[PDB]
Design a protein around this ligand. Sequence first.
Ligand SMILES: CN(C)[C@@H]1C(O)=C(C(N)=O)C(=O)[C@@]2(O)C(O)=C3C(=O)c4c(O)cccc4[C@@](C)(O)[C@H]3C[C@@H]12
Ligand SMILES: CN(C)[C@@H]1C(O)=C(C(N)=O)C(=O)[C@@]2(O)C(O)=C3C(=O)c4c(O)cccc4[C@@](C)(O)[C@H]3C[C@@H]12
Ligand SMILES: [Cl-]
Ligand SMILES: [Cl-]
Ligand SMILES: [Cl-]
Ligand SMILES: [Cl-]
Ligand SMILES: [Cl-]
Ligand SMILES: [Cl-]
Ligand SMILES: [Co+2]
Ligand SMILES: [Co+2]
Lengths: 200, 200
Amino acid sequence: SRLNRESVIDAALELLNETGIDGLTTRKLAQKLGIEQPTLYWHVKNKRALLDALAVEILARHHDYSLPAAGESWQSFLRNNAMSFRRALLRYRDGAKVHLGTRPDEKQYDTVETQLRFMTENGFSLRDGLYAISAVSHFTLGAVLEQQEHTAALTENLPPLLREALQIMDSDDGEQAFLHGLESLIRGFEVQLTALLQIV
Amino acid sequence: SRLNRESVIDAALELLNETGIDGLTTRKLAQKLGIEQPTLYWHVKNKRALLDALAVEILARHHDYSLPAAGESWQSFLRNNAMSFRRALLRYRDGAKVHLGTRPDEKQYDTVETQLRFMTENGFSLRDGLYAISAVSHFTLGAVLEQQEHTAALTENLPPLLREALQIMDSDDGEQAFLHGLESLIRGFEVQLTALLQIV
Ligand SMILES: CN(C)[C@@H]1C(O)=C(C(N)=O)C(=O)[C@@]2(O)C(O)=C3C(=O)c4c(O)cccc4[C@@](C)(O)[C@H]3C[C@@H]12
Ligand SMILES: CN(C)[C@@H]1C(O)=C(C(N)=O)C(=O)[C@@]2(O)C(O)=C3C(=O)c4c(O)cccc4[C@@](C)(O)[C@H]3C[C@@H]12
Ligand SMILES: [Cl-]
Ligand SMILES: [Cl-]
Ligand SMILES: [Cl-]
Ligand SMILES: [Cl-]
Ligand SMILES: [Cl-]
Ligand SMILES: [Cl-]
Ligand SMILES: [Co+2]
Ligand SMILES: [Co+2]
């Protein structure tokens, strides 16, 4: 079929979602696309190139709260941004794994630059803003990774509090724990920011 | 070589550390151990059994701050516990990936039960204690996963704050951002706990 960038990425997203990050082979991608391996190689050099491109596309498609609103607080932006990043990661099988270790792409420069400048305009040094941003990213990735891999994994002598914790854990999709943790994180940054030079 | 549980796990840990989670194949494990595949199969049924066992062993070996000390605060326990969990995950290539989606093993029951009871003895409901514990686990896993996969990945037109953030990011191993985020998390749980029924 068609082998422009957009279509090879569509195909790889479909393949990822069907087979997960282990089935995302250049050989199985070639089968999907109805082509021989040397034909695919012209367009896609290896699995790592595909993984990087998929990371970028996942957020392009489904990460919709990338930028603060007019007059939005840094707290509200971080909350909205995290919920969005989470939704985007959960859209595809192993989407969080796909993101891991990536760095901002050139196509994301203006956006992420705006995110960093915004934090500094709200009083954070660049370093402290980055630390907040990274903590939100890492917490979200962690939570999503554990939720997704646990669903994958699925394929009495318990002590009482653990038994209860497991029901709680298995009683929703993970969103309740994620949102509680998110509020904790945001408020911890707020304490630190407002402390200035005071022992806190 | 020897094929008791302890030795098959040693071997798989060595293999994981050499080849990462993709090289942890039952076929490459068999080569390592100097045996045929049907011989390995008697002892190890599949990659998933191996992954679960490795998750447990990684913490048995190198996760040394599993339980609070006499009179230790819940804040200090969480800090010490997270630093320990982090050290343990970083000990082996893809160790965080190996942990993802696992649930407590029977061998960990008494320990994790103690962790949960401890939080409740410090004022958290089981649910709120679990939410704190999960947030710490998820944040640590996220941070480690991003650090490790980025090292794996490694194989000018930047906007200024991003350029700076990237140097900051690449200026240490990840520990500074992790520890800053950790303090934020812990203090956010503390605000929430102490709030009781007050709007916070
Ligand atoms: C917090 N939230 C999930 C962020 C986000 O909304 C992003 C996006 N493109 O809209 C990211 O790129 C974002 O998700 C993301 O992936 C970020 C990063 O990886 C980095 C890295 O790796 C190194 C330096 C700076 C950044 C960053 C500022 O761009 C990070 C911003 C993250
Ligand atoms: C926070 N810290 C890193 C914890 C820890 O030190 C552990 C350990 N064995 O010492 C875990 O097992 C610990 O790391 C860990 O992996 C935990 C969990 O997976 C769960 C799951 O998955 C579901 C219910 C309850 C737990 C839990 C209470 O045992 C979690 C405790 C985590
Ligand atoms: Cl074409
Ligand atoms: Cl607002
Ligand atoms: Cl503020
Ligand atoms: Cl033997
Ligand atoms: Cl203490
Ligand atoms: Cl307290
Ligand atoms: Co990223
Ligand atoms: Co766990």
